[PDB]
Amino acid sequence: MKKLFLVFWWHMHQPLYREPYTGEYLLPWTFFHAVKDYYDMPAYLKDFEIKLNFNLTPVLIDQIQEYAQGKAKDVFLEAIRKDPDDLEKEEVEKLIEFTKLNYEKPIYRFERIRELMNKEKLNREELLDLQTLNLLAWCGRTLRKDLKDLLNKGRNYTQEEKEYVLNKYFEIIKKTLSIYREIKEEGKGSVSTSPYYHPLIPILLNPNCVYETTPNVKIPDFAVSFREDASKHVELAKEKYFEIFGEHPVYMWPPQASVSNEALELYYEKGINMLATDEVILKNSVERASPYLRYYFRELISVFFRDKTLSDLIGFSYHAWNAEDAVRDFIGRLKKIHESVDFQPVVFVVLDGENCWEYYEENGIPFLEKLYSTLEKEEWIETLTLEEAMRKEDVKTEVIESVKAGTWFDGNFLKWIGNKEKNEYWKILIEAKKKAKNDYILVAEGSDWFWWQGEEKAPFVEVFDKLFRSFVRRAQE
Numbered sequence: 001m002k003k004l005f006l007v008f009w010w011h012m013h014q015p016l017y018r019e020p021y022t023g024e025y026l027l028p029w030t031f032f033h034a035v036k037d038y039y040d041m042p043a044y045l046k047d048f049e050i051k052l053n054f055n056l057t058p059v060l061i062d063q064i065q066e067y068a069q070g071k072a073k074d075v076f077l078e079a080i081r082k083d084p085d086d087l088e089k090e091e092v093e094k095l096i097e098f099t100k101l102n103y104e105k106p107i108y109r110f111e112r113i114r115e116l117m118n119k120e121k122l123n124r125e126e127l128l129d130l131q132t133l134n135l136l137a138w139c140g141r142t143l144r145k146d147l148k149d150l151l152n153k154g155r156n157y158t159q160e161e162k163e164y165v166l167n168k169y170f171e172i173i174k175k176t177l178s179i180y181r182e183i184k185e186e187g188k189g190s191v192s193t194s195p196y197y198h199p200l201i202p203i204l205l206n207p208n209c210v211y212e213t214t215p216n217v218k219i220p221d222f223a224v225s226f227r228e229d230a231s232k233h234v235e236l237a238k239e240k241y242f243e244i245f246g247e248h249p250v251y252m253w254p255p256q257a258s259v260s261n262e263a264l265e266l267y268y269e270k271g272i273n274m275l276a277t278d279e280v281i282l283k284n285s286v287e288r289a290s291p292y293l294r295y296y297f298r299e300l301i302s303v304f305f306r307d308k309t310l311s312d313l314i315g316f317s318y319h320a321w322n323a324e325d326a327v328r329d330f331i332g333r334l335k336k337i338h339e340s341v342d343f344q345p346v347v348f349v350v351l352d353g354e355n356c357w358e359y360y361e362e363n364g365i366p367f368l369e370k371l372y373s374t375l376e377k378e379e380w381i382e383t384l385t386l387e388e389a390m391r392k393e394d395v396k397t398e399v400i401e402s403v404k405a406g407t408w409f410d411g412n413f414l415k416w417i418g419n420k421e422k423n424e425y426w427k428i429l430i431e432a433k434k435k436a437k438n439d440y441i442l443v444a445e446g447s448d449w450f451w452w453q454g455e456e457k458a459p460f461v462e463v464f465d466k467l468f469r470s471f472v473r474r475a476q477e
């Protein structure tokens with residue numbers, strides 16, 4: 001039977017929120033995505049007989065480890081834990097600001113949150129509800145069963161109930177790396193990693209790659225080499241992956257799907273047998289641009305190009321749909337692909353694994369449960385591990401000689417370089433690199449810092465800037 005081969009690759013990442021001089025985690029996002037997504041996404045494999053794959057960046061792994069050991073000093077989480085009588089005005093303000101940032105997301109759909117945000121002043125009981133409902137809004141699928149009664153209570157929480165939630169949340173974090181190891185050892189999914197701090201490897205290897213698809217971009221004078229650092233990000237990531245999973249990684253996810261001829265050469269030289277990237281890069285690079293083939297870059301490394309439409313349906317569209325409409329839509333598009341060719345297509349669905357669900361009803365749990373249940377009941381769909389996709393023999397292949405460098409942002413680098421503010425960050429990094437004395441310069445090469453720079457004002461951007469500049473300073477000492 002002619003099957004459609006479906007490959008999910010869920011990419012998990014957080015930049016380092018731990019400020020190097022105080023040791024404090026200045027934003028809680030690793031904690032909240034750990035309790036909501038990083039355990040629960042692979043845990044779907046306990047209940048659905050499909051294959052799902054995951055990327056974990058090493059810098060994310062480091063932070064999960066620190067939280068699991070009780071070593072993470074998370075400033076926002078300490079304000080949640082406190083009795084409200086001990087909250088500083090600054091801490092109350094940060095709690096309200098965090099609530100307002102998240103207020104319109106369906107995971108914050110508690111009538112008590114709307115009441116609390118319409119109040120001039122908050123008393124102890126109201127602040128206790130504000131703290132506890134912020135915790136509960138990030139509840140993952142597993143604990144939405146354990147904590148179902150607290151979630152339904154909706155108000156009038158006690159300090160002891162809040163502490164119970166915190167304890168269960170840390171229990172989930174402590175089991176998180178173990179469940180990735182478990183689904184890997186059981187063949188239910190493959191796990192990949194990325195260069196250590198999620199940098200833009202093509203730019204570190206050769207900043208002139210930005211001209212390949214944006215020839216008119218203005219960038220600063222890269223008067224220092226980042227090529228050895230690019231190698232170090234890959235090598236350190238192989239070491240961390242070996243510690244956690246017991247092999248050198250043969251699959252990597254390039255951050256931001258970013259590839260170039262030189263980056264593909266580096267990954268191959270470091271022992272990577274397969275990566276994936278974006279469909280826009282495929283169309284920019286070749287004329288006969290089917291994303292359903294396994295490509296071989298210069299007969300040396302395997303490359304899959306994700307189906308951008310399917311990936312972006314989950315990432316951008318379906319949060320606003322009901323779950324049955326969305327799953328029916330997704331299956332219907334898969335049927336069209338299946339019927340459109342006489343061979344067995346390989347269909348990569350690759351996107352962030354933790355960022356879209358907060359915009360779905362009930363944290364995307366009705367959608368994913370229905371999607372996975374429906375997929376496992378379609379005979380003509382076979383979901384694959386990355387290992388299976390790499391080695392599948394009954395698929396079509398093609399050799400590719402050259403790619404036009406870019407990312408999954410429209411095949412180019414403009415989200416990280418090319419305006420005044422983003423270029424200032426590269427200038428700061430370039431000068432720091434000339435004076436660098438330790439691996440904190442690698443932390444500052446993470447793509448996240450440049451992503452947030454030079455964008456229309458938002459809460460907490462000042463924190464990303466404080467972190468970036470602190471790592472740059474620490475790198476020189």
Ligand SMILES: OC[C@H]1O[C@@H]2O[C@H]3[C@H](O)[C@@H](O)[C@@H](O[C@H]4[C@H](O)[C@@H](O)[C@@H](O[C@H]5[C@H](O)[C@@H](O)[C@@H](O[C@H]6[C@H](O)[C@@H](O)[C@@H](O[C@H]7[C@H](O)[C@@H](O)[C@@H](O[C@H]1[C@H](O)[C@H]2O)O[C@@H]7CO)O[C@@H]6CO)O[C@@H]5CO)O[C@@H]4CO)O[C@@H]3CO
Pocket residue numbers: 311312314315316317319350351352355356357359408409410415
């Ligand atoms: O409110 C912003 C946005 O919020 C929510 O989106 C989340 C998303 O759920 C997360 O998965 C993550 O997205 C990842 C993607 O998973 C990953 O694929 C990639 O996306 C690239 C796209 O593939 C590429 O097309 C392009 O995206 C463009 C996009 O095509 C433009 O349409 C425009 O998107 C706007 C949306 O159309 C609009 O609906 C809204 O999006 C919501 C979204 O509905 C919600 O689920 O606003 C956006 C922004 O104006 O612009 C984007 C460029 O940003 O490029 C991206 C690569 O950059 O990477 C993203 C993360 O970067 O995070 C988003 C929130 O950022």
Ligand SMILES: OC[C@H]1O[C@H](O[C@H]2[C@H](O)[C@@H](O)[C@@H](O[C@H]3[C@H](O)[C@@H](O)[C@@H](O[C@H]4[C@H](O)[C@@H](O)[C@@H](O)O[C@@H]4CO)O[C@@H]3CO)O[C@@H]2CO)[C@H](O)[C@@H](O)[C@@H]1O
Pocket residue numbers: 011012013014015029033101256352354355447448449451458459460
């Ligand atoms: O003000 C705009 C936005 O502010 C808030 O967004 C938050 C997120 O909710 C946080 O989770 C965090 O974002 C992390 C993100 O969770 C993490 O996965 C990683 O994202 C990378 C991603 O791995 C990569 O593939 C590509 O997509 O780029 C991303 C960005 O580099 O790192 C993020 C931090 O850099 O922080 C942001 C900013 O506070 C708010 O919730 C949003 O609704 C809002 O749009």
